[PDB]
From a paper:
γ-Aminobutyric acid type A (GABAA) receptors mediate fast inhibitory signaling in the brain and are targets of numerous drugs and endogenous neurosteroids. GABAA receptors belong to the Cys-loop superfamily of pentameric ligand-gated ion channels. GABAA receptors mainly assemble as heteromers, and each subunit shares a common topology, with a large N-terminal extracellular domain (ECD), followed by four transmembrane α-helices (M1-M4; TMD). Binding of GABA to a resting-state receptor results in conformational changes that allow anions, mainly chloride, to pass through the intrinsic TMD channel and, in most cases, inhibit neuronal excitability.
The binding site(s) for sulfated neurosteroids on GABAA receptors is controversial with conflicting findings over the past several decades from electrophysiology and structural biology studies. We sought to resolve this controversy by determining structures of the α1β2γ2 GABAA receptor in complex with GABA + PS and GABA + DHEAS at 2.6 Å and 2.7 Å resolution respectively. To our surprise, both structures bound to NAM neurosteroids revealed multiple potential binding sites for these ligands. We observed a strong density in the ion pore of the PS + GABA and DHEAS + GABA data sets that is absent without the addition of sulfated neurosteroids to the preparations. These sausage-shaped densities follow the central axis of the pore from the −2′ position to the 9′ position, and exhibit features suggestive of the sulfate group orienting up, extracellularly. To test the stability and orientation preferences of sulfated neurosteroids in the channel, we first modeled two poses for each molecule, first with the A ring sulfate oriented toward the extracellular side and the D ring toward the base of the ion channel pore, and second, with the ligand flipped on its long axis, with the sulfate oriented intracellularly. MD simulations showed that the former orientation, with the sulfate up, is relatively stable, in contrast with a tendency for the neurosteroid to move toward the intracellular side when the sulfate is oriented down. Interestingly, whereas DHEAS interactions were primarily with these residues in the inner pore, PS contacts were distributed more broadly among positions −2′, 2′, 5′, 6′, and 9′, and sampled greater deviations from the initial pose. Compared to DHEAS, a less fixed position of PS could reflect its lower apparent affinity for NAM activity at GABAA receptors. We focus on four distinct lipid interactions in our best resolved PS-bound structure. The lipid occupancy for the first outer leaflet site present at both β-α interfaces was modeled as phosphatidylethanolamine (POPE), which is the most abundant lipid in our preparation. The second outer-leaflet lipid, located between the M3 and M4 helices of the β subunits, was modeled as phosphatidylserine (POPS) based on the density features and local environment (site 2).
Residue numbers in the entry:
A (entry chain D), G (entry chain B): 10 to 307
B (entry chain C), F (entry chain A): 7 to 260
C (entry chain K): 2 to 118
D (entry chain E): 25 to 241
E (entry chain L): 1 to 106
Write the structure that this text describes.
């Protein structure tokens, strides 16, 4: 009948517990040792300048008010005990719409070690913001950040730290790559301190370096542009007696280049500078227009 | 009366019941048997690399604390008593958006047995992730799974197993997809290892072979007939400069 | 807060020396425990670390097999044992714990081992 | 320790349905902001997204304690037990707070009853763009908020001197426009319920030419 | 293996003048570079944990300056007890220290 | 003090209060007066056959149980007390998706008066469905309505009426729609009869008239110019067979 | 004090009530009498093979634990009282995503007659499935089902029935039709017994007979196809000495047929068989191509 003794242990733990007070409120600064396991790097939405990422967000602090002494060493408790104790309020500084999964039960975990060391993991789907400088489109490379810190707890109260060597904290699964357009190169973590109007907060940062794949843009813009230019230069080998043929060549090539420019500019966000593909399409337009002008002069 | 007797039995069962502790909290792992009655596979999207399936997800374990020996009938309680029992923390690893249907009530079933066995069914609609290799599209055979893993409990606290091991997943031969066609399905049992332990896992895997009728109708025949039309430019006399050029240019832009 | 290492050792070449590092003022299960060597008038060099909560030990590639790092949670001590040693590793061995930003805030005092005949 | 005693004494005989000074004088609320990013200004729907850190501070003589500690710093576990003003944004099509991982809220109760309540918001505000001079058009369209149920005689809002403070203005998703400035404003509107104090923050956006220059001209 | 090239090898400077030390990392190390001061016949003492954060008990004449790869330790009004080795060690990966700079008075 | 008096008054009002019973549970029906302040009519879709409107929906009834006389002021309680009072079960018949805005709190007002009058306001965003007759598109006038009915209580338990009967709905003249123009609006009070009883009903019926300028500039002018470009082919001499065919054929395709 | 006596009645009514046991748990079988009042038959989506409907789902059973004698016969109680008694867990066997409207309050109704008879009505939008066979498109007719039964209660425990004559149970409102493209002919109800992996349940089926309207497809596909065929046949009456004109006629009529065939296929779901409109488009494409080949032969 271990159920009764373990119930008594749990009720002694929660007897006289205040979850509005962080562990070590008077004489200590709480130390939250975080960690991340990226189960799948979601598709980088280029239109919204966002990206999705599915993580196992792990945290672990030391609560001295949750020491016990029983037959077991680690209490692998249910996720509903995590709501009766104090848990840090980590928020993502750039997350847009994050969801915590509730299928079939809350995807959470809580292991109370016998010496008070807690462990609390969640399964999240963070939709963060990745500001992009599309000046080398489609040969660009980005560094999508993921900044998370504490809310309501300044640096004098809750300090964050990686749980392993900072190079080995953020781990990405091997098969976890939902990227069809980009190519994940590597992660890069860092820890800093941001000032504010309310206080000084600790901010942990993680950049995922990407590298766009040019195959699709080649196939659907650069080949049609080059082929249109060739089809336009075909109009020079026709004899000078066939005027309508060369006129059709010129006009249809100019129309094709116009529609190609339009369809090529639609894929990108409505950006207010010129990309590399834009320069290529402009030069091809100039070539076809010059071919038409040369025919007119002839 | 029989109704008062059953009410007394249920009140006795749920009194002094600790939901925080799984059955056999300090002993061997509990065995949770899974069943799936696939209702439908709605849409297989190549742009989101996902697929939506509606299933009757049922789990069956043995809780000794919910054991009664007064009435001989298999009790069926309201679906709201499931918030006061222990149910395994099962989650689908590769799902993106899922929900238990909640009309006219939350679609779940709780059903005790006089020996402690608990049956627990849900009606779920998971939009799982299906990463596809389209190098043969539309002549391709896809294979994407549904990984069923326990979140909190390691393999020394819970044991997943298909109930029947071949008749666990039913209703697959009745699935009619508009484009694909289920060729084969397999049930696997593994023990994945994460930095926090080794958790059990079941996998349900389909094999969808895409139908080629729609593409032969929509994209192959127009290109073929456009090439046939382009071939007409040879039967015209070589003196016509506009006609032949019209042919080649129209064909090229189409 | 206060790390007490062992004393100096005078070991013959070809033997095994086991240096101890007793931590007083904290529990070793909370932090890591690094072992550092320093030959005379040279830079510091990392040997390996140990996580006393689990027992996961990492070593420098050039110290793998020669040294092993164990712990003792009852006495709050870290042990470094040099399996097979030549006459060249006559350095000073320090014991340190990781600090706030993964630095080594508290160092030991150094057990200067000596290999000769 | 003793902070538990303080928190228990503050919530003994406390009614979170009655604003502080329910029958004496209006409650003065000082509002501050911190604009993270001003989202995309899509003209099709006449809306624009903004993400802010809304901060409200008022005085509550019932949350007044006397101990050595000067300020009580609390998470969102005690927000639903004290009185909280019902500030809503009058021109928001859809807006919502953040809940991952824990509700993004903050509560700081000082020694003399002064309360600070901060939360994180993402507002899809509405503004009817006069689409003349397109694409050579400039807009300056607002973000208005006020109490919902409390008229001017009960809740009065008031900007601080350094209330609204934009962020970096570089990692924002303002593609076609460009942030040039802002200004705060306070007025009083008439409704079927009563007279309300409506605060406003005007953001000045200037459409930068480019995409249209190369897309149509 | 991340290697830290610390420069210069040994400098000699008089009392009361500003001095600067450089530590260039091979790979990326965000701000996990620490500066230790080892006096002769003593154990190294942590000066700057992380880049630009003085440790408790360090005079205000020591300042760090961080980057991705290049790091700097500047001492201001240099006193007479600052004659010691100054090692720089990253911690972004498994810790690797620099060679150290023998500061001298002349 | 005044705060203690108010607290004691409210604690007396909410003590000994039954939410399951409407005011005058045995006697005459309760009279619920409706006000509406339309904030905006957002989008009117001809493809989904619905329109979206944001309003400040307000109702006012008289609960003789929430009557006090010790203080003369109108109490404005926190919107969390509306879960402890009785509020009428008003629902919109032709809505599809609706939601009370919930930032920074649930956007509702609950204000008591010393004579029992309760004032209950909400901020709703309803996607009401209105079928459109497009037989005269785009020279057509649609009539999109919003129907307000009591669900649980029949007409001998509740009575709906507009407060003012012509000033009950405000903010219509300020609504600017990008494509339509509000010609007028009518307020109707009637009763419907279902298989379970006769229920009260109000109706707010707008009469949207569609603008024509955009359509002229977008799709009537091009038609006229294409027909004229077809006519120009009459000035070309009949000897050129490759120019008139070209022109006419292209115009047909356009 | 009339509210006081009614509060006393309602308190005595739920004194010792267990809402986890159906009425007559071991001594009888519950008999839920069902009724449906379709307020609006929503738009039938052809791509998703789904259809929306908006009903007033009425249910009624007899609970002997709710007998009461008082001044009134029926108690028209709130919708929150229905959460403290037992209510059958009806679900739609072929529903995709149904919602239970709660604007402004939860849209529900509970009337407790004095002899224990309950009436429980909900307002809910059901997005049900309707598999369609589109071999006669666009001249097809469907029968979209609406099956509903109980969850967790087999045939030995809960049986369903229609309250009125099975023909007069599923009623449809007069102005309740949002069908843009189809045309509702009539309803047809039926009762049956299905077998699942858990037991043997009772399933109440309702079919809605729909008949597609051909007006839109005529003007969008059949008129243009015929007009293209006629335009392709005009090419004959031209003279045999005007090659560019007839060549332009042919190539343009073909290109137009190709575009028309693509757009026309764009409307329907992606089925793997050939509909009727596709056969018409194929014969028209044949005629056009044959005219081009006749000009080539000439
Ligand atoms: C028609 O029907 C609709 C469906 O029924 C209905 O919508 C529902 O409305 C209700 C009420 O408005 C919602 O319930 C409230 O939700 C608030 C926050 O909502 C956000 O989060 C929910 C999801 O809720 C989970 O996540 C939050 C945040 O982590 C948790 O706080 C919740 O408890 C809950 O956590 C469980 O689930 C998680 C998975 O999601 C698990 O990870 C977790 O482990 C738990 O298992 C979202 O769904 C919301 O989105 C929807 O709503 C927004 C509203 O704007 C929409 O915009 C949006 O589009 C969605 O529709 C939203 O994101 C909760 O805060 C709230 O609970 C507090 O308030 C009540 C009432 O005051 C208290 O009784 C309660 O105790 C809570 O207060 C405690 O906690 C707060 C924390 O802030 C403290 O400040 C407070 O002091 C108090 O602390 C005290 O108690 C604690 C224990 O409770 C204790 O620990 C403390 O120590 C202290 O003692 C309430 O749950 C519900 O979510 C809606 N559902 C849906 C589907 O929309 C709609 O209104 C109906 N319409 C009409 C007209 O009637
Ligand atoms: C009129 C409209 C016509 C529309 C349709 C026309 C279609 C043309 C069909 C004819 C046959 C074309 C043959 C193309 C073969 C397939 C192309 C696949 C491209 C591809 O995936 O390769 C990428 C490489 O891009 C690269 O590395 C590209 C680098 C340079 C691009 C090619 C430069 C062409 C210059 C030609 C000069 C001629 C001018 C003189 C007249 C992949 O890359 P990944 O990143 O995905 O992975 C690999 C790491 N690279
Ligand atoms: C590494 C390359 C980088 C270049 C990037 C951009 C270049 C784009 C255009 C380049 C096109 C190639 C031009 C080669 C032509 C050389 C042969 C010309 C033969 C020639 O001398 O006769 C001229 C024929 O006119 C002509 O040949 C007609 C020329 C037309 C003028 C240019 C039109 C530009 C289009 C601008 C609008 C489009 C902008 C796109 C947004 C008229 O000379 P003559 O009468 O003196 O004859 C007496 C001379 N023996
Ligand atoms: C390529 C360029 C052309 C595109 C530009 C414009 C196209 C030309 C249009 C200009 C003048 C055409 C005038 C036609 C009038 C419009 C037709 C309205 C269709 C319509 O609503 O009728 C449906 C019924 O049609 C039916 O019952 C259909 C059955 C038969 C369809 C007609 C085909 C007959 C074949 C002609 C023989 C030619 C022989 C040549 C050798 C309604 O349907 P409902 O269900 O709503 O209500 C009725 C129950 N049906
Ligand atoms: C009622 C049921 C009808 C349904 C199917 C109809 C679709 C098309 C059928 C066309 C029938 C039109 C009547 C033609 C009879 C008059 C032709 C005169 C004739 O005998 O000479 C022919 C001239 O070439 C020609 O007239 C060229 C004919 C072209 C052959 C067919 C090509 C099919 C192309 C299909 C492509 C796409 C379809 C599927 C997607 C072939 O005789 P000859 O050349 O030896 O001249 C010397 C003959 N005295
Ligand atoms: C995520 O999943 C969990 C577990 O499935 C949901 O927790 C459940 O939440 C409901 C509503 O908050 C709880 O019902 C409540 O029970 C109390 C009695 O304690 C009652 O007074 C309330 O009126 C209400 O009926 C239910 O007990 C709870 N279940 C568990 C096991 O904790 C949670 O709601 C889900 N969250 C979302 C956003 O779906
Ligand atoms: C679809 O794709 C999945 C994913 O690869 C396939 O699952 C694989 O199935 C095979 C055969 O059922 C498994 O092989 C087994 O390996 C174990 C390893 O010990 C061995 O004991 C068994 O005797 C057998 O050889 C394989 O492990 C499994 N892959 C994974 C990752 O679990 C599936 O077969 C594919 N087909 C269908 C129709 O879904
Ligand atoms: C924000 O609002 C405050 C208060 O209305 C403005 O502060 C006033 O600024 C003017 C001119 O700068 C001074 O003359 C007043 O003395 C200020 N009043 C207070 C109470 O500080 C402030 O200018 C506004 N910020 C803007 C418009 O950007
Ligand atoms: C309870 O269920 C089991 C298995 O489903 C069955 O063997 C048994 O007969 C059932 N009990 C009764 C009383 O029918
Ligand atoms: C309460 O509201 C009524 C509504 O007209 C108003 O006449 C009265 O003055 C209000 N009470 C006070 C104290 O102003």
């Amino acid at each position: 009948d271990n159920t009764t003794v373990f119930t008594r242990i749990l009720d002694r733990l929660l007897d006289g517990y205040d979850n509005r007070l962080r562990p070590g409120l008077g004489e200590r600064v709480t130390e939250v040792k975080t960690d991340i396991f990226v189960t799948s790097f979601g598709p980088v939405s280029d239109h919204d300048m966002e990206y999705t990422i599915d993580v196992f967000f792990r945290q672990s602090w030391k609560d001295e008010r949750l020491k016990f002494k029983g037959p077991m060493t680690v209490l692998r408790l249910n996720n509903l005990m995590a709501s009766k104790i104090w848990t840090p309020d980590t928020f993502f500084h750039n997350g847009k719409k994050s969801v915590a999964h509730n299928m079939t039960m809350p995807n959470k975990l809580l292991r109370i070690t016998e010496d008070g060391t807690l462990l609390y993991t969640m399964r999240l789907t963070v939709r963060a913001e990745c500001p992009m400088h599309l000046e080398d489109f489609p040969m660009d490379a980005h560094a999508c950040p993921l900044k998370f810190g504490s809310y309501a707890y300044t640096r004098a109260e809750v300090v964050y730290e990686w749980t392993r060597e900072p190079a080995r904290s953020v781990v990405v699964a091997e098969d976890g790559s939902r990227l069809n357009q980009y190519d994940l190169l590597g992660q890069t973590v860092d820890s800093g301190i941001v000032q504010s109007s309310t206080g000084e907060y600790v901010v942990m940062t993680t950049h995922f370096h990407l590298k766009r794949k040019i195959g699709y843009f080649v196939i659907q813009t650069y080949l049609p542009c080059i082929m249109t230019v060739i089809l336009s230069q075909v109009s020079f080998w026709l004899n000078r007696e066939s005027v309508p043929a060369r006129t059709v060549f010129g006009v249809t090539t100019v129309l094709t280049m116009t529609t190609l420019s339009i369809s090529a500019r639609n894929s990108l966000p409505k950006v207010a500078y010129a990309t590399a593909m834009d320069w290529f399409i402009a030069v091809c337009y100039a070539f076809v227009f010059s071919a038409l002008i040369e025919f007119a002069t002839v | 009366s029989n109704m008062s007797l059953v009410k007394e039995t249920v009140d006795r069962l749920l009194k002094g019941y600790d939901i925080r502790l799984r059955p056999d909290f300090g002993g061997p792992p509990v065995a949770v048997g899974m069943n799936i009655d696939i209702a439908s596979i709605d849409m297989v999207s190549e742009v989101n690399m996902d697929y939506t399936l509606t299933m009757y997800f049922q789990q069956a374990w043995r809780d000794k604390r919910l054991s009664y020996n007064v009435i001989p009938l298999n009790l069926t309680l309201d679906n709201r008593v499931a918030d006061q029992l222990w149910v395994p923390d099962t989650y689908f690893l590769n799902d993106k958006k899922s929900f238990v249907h909640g009309v006219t009530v939350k679609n779940r079933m709780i059903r005790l047995h006089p020996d402690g066995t608990v049956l627990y069914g849900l009606r779920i609609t998971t939009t799982a992730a299906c990463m596809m290799d389209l190098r043969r599209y539309p002549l391709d055979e896809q294979n994407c799974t549904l990984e069923i893993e326990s979140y909190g409990y390691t393999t020394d606290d819970i044991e997943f197993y298909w109930r029947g091991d071949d008749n666990a997943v039913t209703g697959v031969t009745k699935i009619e997809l508009p484009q694909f066609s289920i060729v084969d399905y397999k049930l696997i049992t593994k023990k994945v290892v994460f930095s926090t332990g080794s958790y059990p896992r079941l996998s349900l895997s389909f094999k969808l072979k895409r139908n080629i009728g729609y593409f032969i109708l929509q994209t192959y025949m127009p290109s073929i007939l456009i090439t046939i039309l382009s071939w007409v430019s040879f039967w015209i006399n070589y003196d016509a400069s506009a006609a032949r050029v019209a042919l080649g240019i129209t064909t090229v832009l189409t | 807060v206060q790390l007490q290492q062992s004393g100096a050792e005078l070991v013959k070449p070809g033997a095994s020396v086991k240096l101890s590092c007793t931590a007083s003022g904290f529990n070793i299960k909370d932090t890591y425990m690094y072992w550092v060597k320093q030959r005379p008038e040279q830079g510091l060099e990392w040997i390996g670390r140990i996580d006393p909560a689990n027992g996961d030990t990492k070593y420098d590639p050039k110290f793998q097999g020669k040294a092993t790092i164990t712990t003792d949670t009852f006495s709050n001590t870290a042990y470094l044992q040099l399996s097979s040693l030549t006459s060249e590793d006559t350095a000073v061995y320090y014991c340190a714990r990781k600090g706030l930003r993964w630095a080594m805030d508290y160092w030991g005092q150094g057990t200067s081992v000596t290999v000769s005949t | 320790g003793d902070v538990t005693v303080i928190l228990n004494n503050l919530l003994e005989g406390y009614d979170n349905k009655l604003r502080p000074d329910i029958g004496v004088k209006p409650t003065l609320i000082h509002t501050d902001m911190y604009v993270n990013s001003i989202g995309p200004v899509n003209a099709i729907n006449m809306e624009y997204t903004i993400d802010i850190f809304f901060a409200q501070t008022w005085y509550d003589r019932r949350l007044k304690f006397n101990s050595t500690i000067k300020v009580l710093r609390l998470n969102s576990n005690m927000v639903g037990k004290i009185w909280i003003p019902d500030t809503f944004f009058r021109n928001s099509k859809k807006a919502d707070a953040h809940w991952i991982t824990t509700p993004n809220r903050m509560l700081r109760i000082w020694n003399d009853g002064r309360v600070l309540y901060t939360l994180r918001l993402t507002i899809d505000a509405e503004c009817q763009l006069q689409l003349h001079n397109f694409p050579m058009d400039e807009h300056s369209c607002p973000l208005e908020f006020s109490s919902y149920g409390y008229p001017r005689e009960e809740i009065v809002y008031q900007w601080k001197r350094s209330s609204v403070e934009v962020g970096d203005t570089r990692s924002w998703r303002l593609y076609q426009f460009s942030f040039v400035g802002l200004r705060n404003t306070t007025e009083v509107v008439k409704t079927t319920s009563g007279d309300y104090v409506v605060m406003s923050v005007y953001f000045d956006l200037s459409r930068r030419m480019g995409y249209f220059t190369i897309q149509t001209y | 293996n991340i290697v830290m090239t610390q420069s210069p090898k040994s400098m000699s400077m008089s009392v009361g003048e500003r001095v600067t030390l450089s530590c260039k990392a091979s790979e990326y190390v965000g701000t996990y570079v620490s500066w230790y001061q080892q006096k002769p016949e003593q154990s190294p003492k942590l000066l700057i944990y992380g880049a630009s954060n003085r440790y408790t008990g360090v005079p205000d004449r020591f300042t760090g300056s961080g980057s991705a790869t290049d790091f700097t330790l500047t001492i201001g009004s240099v006193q007479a007890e600052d004659l010691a080795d100054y090692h720089c060690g990253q911690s972004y990966s498994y810790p690797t220290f620099g060679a150290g700079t023998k500061l001298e008075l002349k």
